[PDB]
Design a protein around this ligand. Sequence first.
Ligand SMILES: [Cu+2]
Ligand SMILES: [Cu+]
Ligand SMILES: [Cu+]
Ligand SMILES: [Zn+2]
Ligand SMILES: [Zn+2]
Lengths: 160, 155
Amino acid sequence: TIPKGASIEVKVQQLDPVNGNKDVGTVTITESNYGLVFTPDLQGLSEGLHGFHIHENPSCEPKEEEGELTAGLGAGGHWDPKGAKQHGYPWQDDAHLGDLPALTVLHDGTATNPVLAPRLKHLDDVRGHSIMIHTGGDNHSDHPAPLGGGGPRMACGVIK
Amino acid sequence: ASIEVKVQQLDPVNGNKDVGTVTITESNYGLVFTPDLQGLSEGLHGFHIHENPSCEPKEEEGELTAGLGAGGHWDPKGAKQHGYPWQDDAHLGDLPALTVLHDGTATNPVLAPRLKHLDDVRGHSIMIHTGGDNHSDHPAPLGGGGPRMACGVIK
Ligand SMILES: [Cu+2]
Ligand SMILES: [Cu+]
Ligand SMILES: [Cu+]
Ligand SMILES: [Zn+2]
Ligand SMILES: [Zn+2]
């Protein structure tokens, strides 16, 4: 059911530039007294922890990258309006504002565990951007791998 | 400043086994619980702070229930209701669920936004349940975490 209070229901697509994207559920965004809450209702995804971030552009389209059609590159990089210029924790002030807690996909491929982004206070702020779910996880650092080790873009949705 | 909590998988019979630690630190948005666990069953697990600084099993109805010595959910404000970590009228001990990967390890940190001071959690215990946590007493009271799987005392 639509949650109580203002909310944004984002459609999420498993990305595959060649075989076509596949709708795998939604991520509903609400406003708690401690920041925005992202509640997933996804299915058919790879088990494990997955990097979860807000990206700059309101697009999930693929883009040619060095001769390879790469999924979700149209979304741009991690949303960093405050110019932290480094990937970090959801509770770290000098980290990309788009850095959310990692998403958990169970063994059965489903994801329903909500996560909080304490630095995001208003719904309107995330409108006009995209939400990304990566193949890899997120250690909330640019070391030993850039952007938390998220790597490829596995699923994506545009926040209207 | 930090608190390193030693965690053990509970088993009142053969004994408990050290499964790692959970380190508690302060952030500008609340206490962060960073696990470094291993040897646990994969999946999402209920994660809460319980009232007593004990992980001892307690005999109940002819049975020796594990981790019962820790008491119920830490609830200093008397919310008398289980809920979300960002829910003000829920137990203050209600933390975000913990993720154990397929390989049995847990290293993903979680934030408890309503907990602002490190000292406030001292003298209690942290519990990891067999089941998950739907952050409500409905349909199952206390989130449906079921049995107490692992536990550590917060010093
Ligand atoms: Cu698995
Ligand atoms: Cu991302
Ligand atoms: Cu518990
Ligand atoms: Zn980032
Ligand atoms: Zn509770």
